[PDB]
């Protein structure tokens, strides 16, 4: 388990080596205010009308009373411009701001926990994860716990037994085909069908798909071993 | 999930393809451009939005041909083969509740002349510019991913979601779902023909519901009629005046000359420009809204198609079991069962 | 001789897979991988 | 039954406690196996 950590620790850093544009989600965020700062200081050359977009042309060449229909265009075309910018600005801030929400409530549940949410720590039953900081955001590395190399089984809801019958207390029921025995859910690791394995409900008749198979008894076999003990006791016995 | 992807010709919205307009357009500068962007970036979100809602499967899994899973009757939910689009038969109702207003397909220029330009406002939308963009992933696309959802949750429980998917009798999957409600699982198999019985019921109930009421898909065609209101909106905008002698560019062009003709076509630009600024405004605020939703179909869909939910509420009205995705026009049906 | 060119094709959405379930059988990992998977948030 | 229950403490810090029986399933079978041993002790007295 360690040496599949340390191995997929060492993937993130040739990845990251490697790769150009993984990080795309936070360089398109610089992108895109880099991109609205240019276009809203290209709008500066744009006439809107007036005879020129150089404020001090204008000033240079018309006068007081003919000179402000020229600038008056200008105002109403830049103030435009930064009324364009603010609201894409407002808008773009409501996404990052829902970005943050997530990245917040990813480190409570992700960080801080463990996890029951599917996919919502990465992809696998969660583990745990650990926040790196990126420039304007967050990375988490999360880990998880993916299984593998499955074999086929038959299987059974329940096994009867002394006509009644037994369900699993944790696991489930499986066969090799000759056998059967319970193992847990999510990790093969067989184990003989016991009381103490299993739990009972009514009897063999109402369950479809029950199979016979033994159920074993713990304390059976040393109580008995205590009765081939009380009859060594009382053959020696008949000799007083 | 998503909204009609729509695209504009700035230019030819604003100016009738008359070039005096064009020419005078130029003096505004990059606002076309910021616009055209404006709805690409929208448009390509409806793409992401339906790959992150739909596209959480690894293989497009499928049911064995014997369709026994301990008595419960998944037929009117999985796809039907009879259909030349393999939806089921509830995602073949959600498709009639739903009517579009345009899809993005072709028109043959023999659609749009003569009489259905008179009838259908489509047209008038297209000669303005106003296009529709069809969706990256079509309806039988949509059945694809949303069957292979359903296939891998009905033969393989949550196991698909976290790993490969592991077979497990279907009962049995439902013995763990009690389990993790805290009901011992022999109440299951102690009244698995009644629990049956009452699900394929409940599956019968969605059905009767479907057919009979008009507006519950409420949800989805109030984004068609709003993206539908919205472009039939700007269109009528190109009948204002904005204090011009005329809304009719050609009208200014038959009857002034290139100096006072000018003051009549700033106008018209200002206005038509402001038009579509309204417009792309709204469309971005309306595309946070459905974006909002996307991510909320996808953890719907991680949650509680993907894994069985513990939180309260979340995935329907009870302890939850399973659900299961249905497609719909611009949308997600879930089937959420509940204990 | 071969040679590169602009290509136009109907998407794959994943390989194809019929799950192998029935009345009476389990599929159970007999082992598992640990994995590190990058989340990247602005 | 003291298997489907755990104890802890006396029944004096906790309000509301109720007095009722605890069935142990290894005691029945314990006296089972000692009418059992008694039976043989009384078959013994023979030899
Ligand atoms: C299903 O799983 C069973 C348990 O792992 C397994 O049964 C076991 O089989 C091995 C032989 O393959 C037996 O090994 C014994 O071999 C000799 C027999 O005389 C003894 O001297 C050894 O000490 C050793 O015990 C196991 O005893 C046997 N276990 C039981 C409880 O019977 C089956 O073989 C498996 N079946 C399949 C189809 O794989
Ligand atoms: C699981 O093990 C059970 C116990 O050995 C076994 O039940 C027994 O099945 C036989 C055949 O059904 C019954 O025999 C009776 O069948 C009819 C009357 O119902 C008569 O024609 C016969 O003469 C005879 O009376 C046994 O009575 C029955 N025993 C019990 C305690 O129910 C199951 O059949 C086994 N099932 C499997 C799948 O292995
Ligand atoms: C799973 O649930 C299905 C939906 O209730 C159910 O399908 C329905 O089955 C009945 C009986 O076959 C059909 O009734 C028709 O039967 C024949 C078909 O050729 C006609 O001659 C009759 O006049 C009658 O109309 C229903 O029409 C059919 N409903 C649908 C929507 O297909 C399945 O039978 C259930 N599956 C199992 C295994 O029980
Ligand atoms: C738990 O709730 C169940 C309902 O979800 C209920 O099942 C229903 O039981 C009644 C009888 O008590 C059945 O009614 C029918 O019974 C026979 C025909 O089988 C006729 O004599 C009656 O007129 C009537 O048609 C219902 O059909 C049955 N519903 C289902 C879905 O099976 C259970 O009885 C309840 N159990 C307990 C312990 O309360
Ligand atoms: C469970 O999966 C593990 C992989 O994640 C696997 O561990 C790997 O086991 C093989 C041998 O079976 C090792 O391969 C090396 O083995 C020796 C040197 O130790 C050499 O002869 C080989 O050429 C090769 O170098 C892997 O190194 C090892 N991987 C790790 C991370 O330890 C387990 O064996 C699997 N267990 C079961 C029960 O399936
Ligand atoms: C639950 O069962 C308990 C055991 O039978 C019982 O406790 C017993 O209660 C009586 C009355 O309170 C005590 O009797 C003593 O009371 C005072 C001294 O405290 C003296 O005046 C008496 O002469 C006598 O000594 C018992 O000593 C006490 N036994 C124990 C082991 O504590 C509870 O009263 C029962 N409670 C209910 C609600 O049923
Ligand atoms: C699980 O088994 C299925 C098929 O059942 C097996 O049949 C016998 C041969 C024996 O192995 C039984 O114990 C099993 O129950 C496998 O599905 C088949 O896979 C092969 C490729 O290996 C393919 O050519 C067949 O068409 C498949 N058949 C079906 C019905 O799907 C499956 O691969 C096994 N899974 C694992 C994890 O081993
Ligand atoms: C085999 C056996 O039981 N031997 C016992 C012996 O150990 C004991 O000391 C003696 C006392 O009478 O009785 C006999
Ligand atoms: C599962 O059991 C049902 C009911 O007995 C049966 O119809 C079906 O054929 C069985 N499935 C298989 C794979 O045989
Ligand atoms: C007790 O002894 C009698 C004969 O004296 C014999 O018939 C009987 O089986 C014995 N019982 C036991 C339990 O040993």
């Not at chain 1, 411009?81 to 990245?103: F, G, M």
């Not at chain 1, 037994?161 to 067989?190: C, I, L």
């Not at chain 2, 069809?134 to 696309?141: G, I, N, S």
């Amino acid at each position: 388990i360690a040496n599949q950590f340390n191995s997929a620790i060492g993937k993130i850093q040739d990845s990251l080596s490697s790769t150009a544009s993984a990080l795309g989600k936070l360089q398109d965020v610089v992108n895109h205010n880099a991109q609205a700062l240019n276009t809203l200081v290209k709008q500066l050359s744009s006439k809107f009308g007036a005879i020129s977009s150089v404020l001090n042309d204008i000033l240079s060449r018309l006068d007081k009373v003919e000179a402000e229909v020229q600038i008056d265009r200008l105002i109403t075309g830049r103030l435009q411009s930064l009324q364009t910018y603010v609201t894409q600005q407002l808008i773009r801030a409501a996404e990052i701001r829902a970005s943050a929400n997530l990245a917040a409530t990813k480190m409570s549940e992700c960080v801080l926990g463990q996890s029951k949410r599917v996919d919502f720590c990465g992809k696998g039953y969660h583990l745990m994860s650990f926040p790196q900081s990126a420039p304007h955001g967050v990375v988490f590395l999360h880990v998880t716990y993916v299984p593998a190399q499955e074999k086929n089984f038959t299987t059974a809801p329940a096994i009867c037994h002394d006509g009644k019958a037994h369900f699993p207390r944790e696991g489930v029921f499986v066969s090799n085909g000759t056998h059967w025995f319970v193992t847990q859910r999510n990790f093969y690791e067989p184990q003989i069908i016991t009381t103490d394995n299993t739990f009972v409900s009514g009897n063999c008749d109402v369950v479809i798909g029950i199979v016979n198979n033994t159920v074993y008894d713990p304390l059976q076999p040393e109580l008995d071993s205590f009765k081939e003990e009380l009859d060594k006791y009382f053959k020696n016995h008949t000799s007083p | 999930v998503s909204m009609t992807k729509t695209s504009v010709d700035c230019t030819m919205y604003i100016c009738g393809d008359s070039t005096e307009c064009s020419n005078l357009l130029l003096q505004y500068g990059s606002f076309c451009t910021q616009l055209k962007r404006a709805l690409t970036g929208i448009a390509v979100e409806q793409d992401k939005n339906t790959q992150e809602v739909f596209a959480q499967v690894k293989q497009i899994y499928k049911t064995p041909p014997i369709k026994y899973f301990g008595g419960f009757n998944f037929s009117q939910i999985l796809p039907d083969p009879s259909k030349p689009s393999k939806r089921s038969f509830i995602e073949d109702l959600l498709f009639n509740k739903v009517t579009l207003a345009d899809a993005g397909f072709i028109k043959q220029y023999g659609d749009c002349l003569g009489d259905i330009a008179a009838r259908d406002l489509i047209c008038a939308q297209k000669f303005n510019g106003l296009t529709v963009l069809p969706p990256l992933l079509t309806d039988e696309m949509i059945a694809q991913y949303t069957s292979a959802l359903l296939a891998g949750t009905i033969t393989s429980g949550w196991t698909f979601g976290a790993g490969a998917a592991l077979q497990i009798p279907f009962a049995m999957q439902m013995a763990y779902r009690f389990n993790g409600i805290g009901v011992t699982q022999n109440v299951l198999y102690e009244n698995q023909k009644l629990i049956a019985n009452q699900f394929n019921s409940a599956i019968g109930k969605i059905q009767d519901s479907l057919s009979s009421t008009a507006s519950a898909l409420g949800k989805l065609q109030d984004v068609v009629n709003h993206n539908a209101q919205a472009l039939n909106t700007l269109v009528k905008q190109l009948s204002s005046k904005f204090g011009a002698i005329s809304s009719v560019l050609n009208d200014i062009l038959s009857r002034l000359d290139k100096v006072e003709a000018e003051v009549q076509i700033d106008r018209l630009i200002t206005g038509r420009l402001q038009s579509l600024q309204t417009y792309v405004t709204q469309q971005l605020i309306r595309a946070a809204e459905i974006r909002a939703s996307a991510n909320l179909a996808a953890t719907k869909m991680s949650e509680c198609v993907l894994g069985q939910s513990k939180r309260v509420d979340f995935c329907g009205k009870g302890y939850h079991l399973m659900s299961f995705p249905q497609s719909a026009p611009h949308g997600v049906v879930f089937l959420h069962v509940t204990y | 001789v071969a040679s590169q060119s602009i290509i136009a094709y109907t998407m794959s959405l994943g390989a194809e897979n019929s799950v192998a379930y029935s009345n009476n059988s389990i599929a159970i990992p007999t082992n598992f991988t640990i994995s590190v998977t990058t989340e990247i948030l602005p």
